[PDB]
Design a protein around this ligand. Sequence first.
Ligand SMILES: CC[C@H](C)[C@H]1C(=O)N(Cc2cc3ccccc3c3ccccc23)C[C@@H]2N(C(=O)NCCCC(F)(F)F)CCC(=O)N12
Ligand SMILES: CC[C@H](C)[C@H]1C(=O)N(Cc2cc3ccccc3c3ccccc23)C[C@@H]2N(C(=O)NCCCC(F)(F)F)CCC(=O)N12
Ligand SMILES: CC[C@H](C)[C@H]1C(=O)N(Cc2cc3ccccc3c3ccccc23)C[C@@H]2N(C(=O)NCCCC(F)(F)F)CCC(=O)N12
Ligand SMILES: CC[C@H](C)[C@H]1C(=O)N(Cc2cc3ccccc3c3ccccc23)C[C@@H]2N(C(=O)NCCCC(F)(F)F)CCC(=O)N12
Ligand SMILES: CC[C@H](C)[C@H]1C(=O)N(Cc2cc3ccccc3c3ccccc23)C[C@@H]2N(C(=O)NCCCC(F)(F)F)CCC(=O)N12
Ligand SMILES: CC[C@H](C)[C@H]1C(=O)N(Cc2cc3ccccc3c3ccccc23)C[C@@H]2N(C(=O)NCCCC(F)(F)F)CCC(=O)N12
Ligand SMILES: CC[C@H](C)[C@H]1C(=O)N(Cc2cc3ccccc3c3ccccc23)C[C@@H]2N(C(=O)NCCCC(F)(F)F)CCC(=O)N12
Ligand SMILES: CC[C@H](C)[C@H]1C(=O)N(Cc2cc3ccccc3c3ccccc23)C[C@@H]2N(C(=O)NCCCC(F)(F)F)CCC(=O)N12
Ligand SMILES: [Mg+2]
Ligand SMILES: [Mg+2]
Ligand SMILES: [Mg+2]
Ligand SMILES: [Mg+2]
Ligand SMILES: [Mg+2]
Ligand SMILES: [Mg+2]
Lengths: 192, 184, 189, 186, 184, 188, 187, 193
Amino acid sequence: LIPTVIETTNRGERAYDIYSRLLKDRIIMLGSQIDDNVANSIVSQLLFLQAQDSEKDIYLYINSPGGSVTAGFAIYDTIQHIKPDVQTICIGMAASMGSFLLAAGAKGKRFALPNAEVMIHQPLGGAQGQATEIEIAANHILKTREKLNRILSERTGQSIEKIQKDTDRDNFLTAEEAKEYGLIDEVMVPET
Amino acid sequence: LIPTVIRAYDIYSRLLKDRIIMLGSQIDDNVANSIVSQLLFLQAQDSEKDIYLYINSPGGSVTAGFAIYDTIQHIKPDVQTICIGMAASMGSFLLAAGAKGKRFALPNAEVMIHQPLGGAQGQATEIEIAANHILKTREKLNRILSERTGQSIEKIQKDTDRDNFLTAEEAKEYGLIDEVMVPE
Amino acid sequence: LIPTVIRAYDIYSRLLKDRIIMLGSQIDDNVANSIVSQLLFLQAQDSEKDIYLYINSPGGSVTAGFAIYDTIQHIKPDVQTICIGMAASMGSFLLAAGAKGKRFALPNAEVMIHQPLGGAQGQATEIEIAANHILKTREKLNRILSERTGQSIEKIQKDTDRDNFLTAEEAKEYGLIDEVMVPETKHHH
Amino acid sequence: NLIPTVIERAYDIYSRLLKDRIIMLGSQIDDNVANSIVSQLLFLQAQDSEKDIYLYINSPGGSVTAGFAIYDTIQHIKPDVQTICIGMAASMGSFLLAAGAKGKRFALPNAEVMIHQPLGGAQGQATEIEIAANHILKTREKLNRILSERTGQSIEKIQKDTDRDNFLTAEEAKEYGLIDEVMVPE
Amino acid sequence: NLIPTVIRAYDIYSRLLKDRIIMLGSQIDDNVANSIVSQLLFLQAQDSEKDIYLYINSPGGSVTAGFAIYDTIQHIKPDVQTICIGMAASMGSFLLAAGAKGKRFALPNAEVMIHQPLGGAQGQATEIEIAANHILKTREKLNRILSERTGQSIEKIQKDTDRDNFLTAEEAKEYGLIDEVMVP
Amino acid sequence: LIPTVIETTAYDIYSRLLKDRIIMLGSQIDDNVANSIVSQLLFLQAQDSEKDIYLYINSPGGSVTAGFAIYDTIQHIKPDVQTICIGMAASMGSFLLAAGAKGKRFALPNAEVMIHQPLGGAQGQATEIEIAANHILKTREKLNRILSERTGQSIEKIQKDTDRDNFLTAEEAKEYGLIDEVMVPETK
Amino acid sequence: LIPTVIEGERAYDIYSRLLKDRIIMLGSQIDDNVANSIVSQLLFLQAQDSEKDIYLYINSPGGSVTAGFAIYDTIQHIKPDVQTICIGMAASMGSFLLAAGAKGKRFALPNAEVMIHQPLGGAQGQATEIEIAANHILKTREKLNRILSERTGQSIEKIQKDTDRDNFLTAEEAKEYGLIDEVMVPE
Amino acid sequence: LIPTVIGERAYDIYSRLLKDRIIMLGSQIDDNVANSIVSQLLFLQAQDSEKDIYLYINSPGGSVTAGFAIYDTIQHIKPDVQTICIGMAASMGSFLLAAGAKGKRFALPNAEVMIHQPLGGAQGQATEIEIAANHILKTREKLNRILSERTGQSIEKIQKDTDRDNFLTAEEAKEYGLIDEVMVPETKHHHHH
Ligand SMILES: CC[C@H](C)[C@H]1C(=O)N(Cc2cc3ccccc3c3ccccc23)C[C@@H]2N(C(=O)NCCCC(F)(F)F)CCC(=O)N12
Ligand SMILES: CC[C@H](C)[C@H]1C(=O)N(Cc2cc3ccccc3c3ccccc23)C[C@@H]2N(C(=O)NCCCC(F)(F)F)CCC(=O)N12
Ligand SMILES: CC[C@H](C)[C@H]1C(=O)N(Cc2cc3ccccc3c3ccccc23)C[C@@H]2N(C(=O)NCCCC(F)(F)F)CCC(=O)N12
Ligand SMILES: CC[C@H](C)[C@H]1C(=O)N(Cc2cc3ccccc3c3ccccc23)C[C@@H]2N(C(=O)NCCCC(F)(F)F)CCC(=O)N12
Ligand SMILES: CC[C@H](C)[C@H]1C(=O)N(Cc2cc3ccccc3c3ccccc23)C[C@@H]2N(C(=O)NCCCC(F)(F)F)CCC(=O)N12
Ligand SMILES: CC[C@H](C)[C@H]1C(=O)N(Cc2cc3ccccc3c3ccccc23)C[C@@H]2N(C(=O)NCCCC(F)(F)F)CCC(=O)N12
Ligand SMILES: CC[C@H](C)[C@H]1C(=O)N(Cc2cc3ccccc3c3ccccc23)C[C@@H]2N(C(=O)NCCCC(F)(F)F)CCC(=O)N12
Ligand SMILES: CC[C@H](C)[C@H]1C(=O)N(Cc2cc3ccccc3c3ccccc23)C[C@@H]2N(C(=O)NCCCC(F)(F)F)CCC(=O)N12
Ligand SMILES: [Mg+2]
Ligand SMILES: [Mg+2]
Ligand SMILES: [Mg+2]
Ligand SMILES: [Mg+2]
Ligand SMILES: [Mg+2]
Ligand SMILES: [Mg+2]
């Protein structure tokens, strides 16, 4: 399914699957629903790239509907921990934890292509069982939402109260609207 | 298949003629609708004679249980309650709701109390509403259980945090029933 | 199994003899068809005497609820509404539609209000038609609830955006009912 | 859901209403529903060919041929068949609402009326698909014209207005010509 | 759902049977055929001279069950009128055409459809052969009788039923499947 | 299933075509397919930012956002991206066919092109239905605007012509402005 | 499992080995995946040598009409003659592609089975949606029948009549019909 | 898992056997199996058009058209194709067993051979059933004719003998003309002398 690229060297042929070829140039793909497997791979790629060169930028491609919040925070905290700037670029769509991570790229280096779609909303979950178990689960997801909104406020310049209102239901943004919101810095226009 | 006794009655309708109502299954809206309609009918037949509510039930819907609860307290006749077999959760709540002095259990009947159960899926704000609602429902149940048993609200809360099984004698000491009915 | 009382009647048919109608389930077309026919029958028997609508319902179909609603408003007799157990969504809409001054709930009954639910699949234009339809239905429900409760249309809108649970006393203060029904006068001897 | 019994003799509630020439179309229209309704119409005509019949309609529609069983029986018999929409009348249901005796087609104020084109399907060879398409197109033309005749609207307007689901209030259905009066409370 | 009762108390269909009307209002299987032919035999016994009325709103079904109805109609003495209301397809339209000559009707918007029989066969080549010969022979029998009852040639019936062929009531009359379209 | 070819100076056949700057869009469009194609585009631009790229399209369409991932990457990079429809291009597939470099959008004579409006759904509260409805309508406005720009047809004509499934022959797709040329076979 | 052959040393699965000698396998139901592979193989072989013949093996029950036309149009586009040989069966779009080989170079082995019929499809929904689907599949059938007429020498009316229902032909009958040029007899 | 054997080349066991011109027909015959076998036959002919090929047959049969893909490719190519039944050869599998080079069709002593008529189906209108019935009947006539030529039995005898499942020992399949020889084991003295 995934194509292979083969390039000529002085000692023969060099074969990569396409994504590993991009990782050679410090490009990481967040191109699926965020689960623990996806997050583990991404944070390992980040750790490896920092070790290769702690000064060159890293590029995080984001085409993702979101997914697990804790998995998203694995990626978020690793981005903040390492030294290199991590650029983010939304191509296609970034929704929920996907758009949260978009907004977490290095300031000035968060991008979207002109027709990319950005969506923000509140976290989702569930709870079954006794009243006290329901209470624990509710308190947890409310605290998780407050943590998300606080960081989003710091990253966008929007107040926490406005974030709360704007994420109560699904909120779709064009690339330009996401820039005006403070989720990205620039809509990347086509090269000449 | 329910036997007939001879006017010809199925056995349960025959018992209803002598003012006996069966709460003998899981409590859902159908069961509750039937029981509260029987209560209203019996009140109309005679506003002074006692009514006898048989309880062999694992509980079920809290709102359906409160339909039965509110109709019992509304009507003029005393409603006796007798636990035979088991009364668990909303069933034991209704056992405690019978006319005071007239709440009974047979010696080997099982009584169980616990907190209400529910669920919620969706957005954080939806989970919050569902949580606030079932917590308020539990506070409502505990307050009434406190009034009917004489136990404090704090003791009810602690004693219902997990499944709490009581013998008939223990249900009497707790105040859920008034007497263990001896042979026969 | 529904008990019989002795002519022999099942218990619900016995209550219908005293002008009591049961709304005790999820509201679908079958349930609404039965209730509106009972209403038509009772009006024909006596166009002056009150009718009693028992409500223990989580709601259900909006159009089916409006079948009941329009039949209640059409006929001459007052239709009392009595919430026992629960009245949610279309169920609480119908609780609020009873004859004014004759809408009741028992002390521990639960009243819940919220916006209608629905769905849509297909082409953008088909989704648009379905969306405009359910929005218009919500406006229709909110307008009538506003008239019946005395609350403004915008307050109803805010208060039904999500599930809103009310105690019987809170439903009275809201205007969904007129009275929390107290226990009957009985002797202490 | 048990149907209550009334005393007058003892009837289930729907049989009691049928004693007063009231017929219930309160479900999806299939052949079973249609056969029952047309038999009730035939029975009521035989009891009295002059006195009105009352057709209650709370239906999402259904089978077109089953709908035409009801339509053709209404038109055949002598008594006027009043129609009243209570709750909803959609698709074939609203077609039958519009088929009641002229001047005696009603809706209650909050009833919902919906009109749209017929639905169907076809699987198989190209020639089989062609046959099914020609058939359902012919059925749509048949429906649109009767609707044009019953409403006073041009066929082309019916065609455009039924291309997609078209929801109407009771008042809009009156102005469209599908009903004669919105029955208001007194 | 429920079939209404009319008042002696009759369900509506039994009331219609009282006036010699038989309902063919569903897909034709053996159960439907057994009921209809029993009604036919009973009605003949009640009166061998008065007409019988067969209502037809059917998509067809089993060919042998259809021929049970066909043969019983031809056997008895009373004329059996047929009236298509709603739809008559395949074996349904075959039985419509089998009504007493001059007494086959359709209401103006009734739908009539004719086509060839449908079936299947699985297994060994020789088993497939037996089933193929059987359904071809069955088609020959239907076409021969349809020719006699419509006045159309066998070759035309064969061509006209090769694929689903929908007819209006007026077209069904011109074809010879019915005698008149019943006007209001 | 997929054959291997080996040159001596081993590829699956599609990787061999990628060596000559040919990308396959040969399936329903989901995020995985889009991620692969946009990465191939980025890689080919880096190999040579002047040589044309060739996008083969045999697709019934699929995800609109995934299609726009491909659309935006095509417009972003320097090389012209030719598009050729072989077999079928429907819905987002025909949108991407129309997005190829002006003058370099092709179809073979019997290829099938279909345009229609986007599909979706919504279930839940009235307010949720409204949000989903407003979103897919805005998505349709976005698709129609770009299709207008790429074809020369008015937005109003695109709207009318995509209300229901609209099948076009390759030649009709050329007259519509979705492609520039039908590539006709050589004489013998 | 597909066996490997070894010819330094180089290993091929048997189908990749045959492709090395300009042989392409159409041995399954025709869907987009099968069509994408075959047209890519055709493009590759043309690039290897634009003059030398290509051999298309056909053992297929047919499948998607658009996928088949992807293969049809690529065959006609490239310079090399594409021989077709039916081995086992060629039905529906399979027999259409069989008839589409370079003229003089369409073959079947003596017991190969050839079947022609009209295209199959479906439609669900509103009357207007059914009409669109019907008009589409009728136009597709006309297009197929037109090309089959040109490739076989039969009139369009005869193709329409002969494909109304499933029509089975022996290899010899396919030759007389004009679907193939020769029955390849054993040596 | 299929074991590997080891210039220094590594082969899975079946590919190693193919190097010595041995082809495995060891499963139900569908189009995939047939496509693989005919490609192996074509490859082996191109390697050497004179040397024998060995077709191992342990198969319950399957698709008739897929079987005829194998049959016609065997008859087309120049090398003799030996057939050896090991385990079982049923229906189309036994048809291919009888199709081996004359004098070179074998079975081991406890191998099972079964012949029967082809199986199929038909659904739909009477005329569609007629078309499917006529087709499978002609296919059976085609099979019976070739089996008659290959075995020496008359077409009418084959018809009768395949009307139902017909199980044959290796010796009975030889007497029938489906194979030429039962390959008997050599004794210990036979193996050393
Ligand atoms: C002082 C640097 C680290 C704070 C510290 C340490 O805490 N951790 C844990 C760790 C593990 C981990 C695992 C997966 C993903 C993210 C992480 C991660 C992310 C953020 C912070 C910590 C982690 C491993 C890391 N080491 C590392 O980076 N070695 C260089 C070679 C790296 C290469 F190339 F192998 F990738 C091993 C040596 C080491 O001291 N540390
Ligand atoms: C004064 C009695 C009631 C306060 C009052 C009234 O509010 N309601 C509503 C109601 C309906 C209902 C429905 C089902 C279940 C419970 C209930 C219920 C339970 C508690 C309180 C009220 C209800 C009906 C009842 N009536 C009744 O009892 N009639 C006499 C014959 C009754 C018989 F025999 F038919 F059962 C009808 C006349 C009437 O004034 N009322
Ligand atoms: C005041 C006259 C009515 C406006 C008018 C008329 O429009 N309708 C239709 C109808 C049918 C219907 C059907 C089911 C449910 C609701 C309804 C309904 C509800 C509201 C308004 C109308 C309906 C039947 C009713 N008739 C009726 O009431 N007969 C007396 C015996 C009644 C008894 F006992 F049988 F129930 C039949 C005679 C009659 O003139 N009308
Ligand atoms: C108006 C008279 C009819 C032109 C004629 C005739 O054609 N038919 C067939 C028929 C059958 C049928 C069957 C089901 C539904 C609809 C129908 C139907 C509807 C419309 C037209 C015809 C039908 C039966 C009817 N008869 C009838 O009405 N008898 C009186 C007592 C009837 C009672 F009480 F039993 F209902 C039997 C005697 C009779 O002459 N005719
Ligand atoms: C005309 C006389 C019959 C040739 C003969 C005879 O062969 N049969 C078998 C039979 C059974 C049957 C069963 C189901 C459906 C069709 C049939 C049927 C149809 C056609 C021909 C025969 C049948 C029963 C019938 N009898 C009958 O009709 N008695 C009068 C009371 C009738 C009543 F009211 F009960 F219906 C019993 C007496 C009797 O001699 N015969
Ligand atoms: C100034 C050039 C780019 C604007 C910028 C940058 O924004 N991005 C993000 C990106 C990532 C991405 C990921 C997947 C698909 C599409 C994209 C994509 C598509 C359009 C625009 C941006 C992207 C990566 C790219 N880099 C790149 O192309 N390096 C050369 C080698 C590339 C090779 F060979 F590895 F493919 C890494 C170095 C770099 O500065 N940039
Ligand atoms: C004669 C020139 C072509 C008309 C033109 C061009 O339009 N296309 C698109 C295309 C893509 C495609 C993709 C898959 C299947 C069929 C096709 C296809 C089939 C028919 C016609 C076109 C295509 C690619 C092709 N190129 C090619 O053949 N390069 C040589 C190396 C080829 C090798 F070895 F890699 F296969 C790339 C260079 C080029 O100009 N063209
Ligand atoms: C004996 C010569 C052939 C009549 C003729 C020709 O018609 N065909 C089609 C064909 C394709 C095919 C495909 C799969 C299975 C069976 C077949 C098959 C079986 C029987 C007859 C034909 C085929 C390919 C074959 N060629 C071949 O054998 N090349 C040498 C290298 C072969 C190797 F090693 F690659 F296998 C290509 C050169 C060639 O002229 N022909
Ligand atoms: Mg960083
Ligand atoms: Mg009391
Ligand atoms: Mg009223
Ligand atoms: Mg009339
Ligand atoms: Mg470009
Ligand atoms: Mg060519």
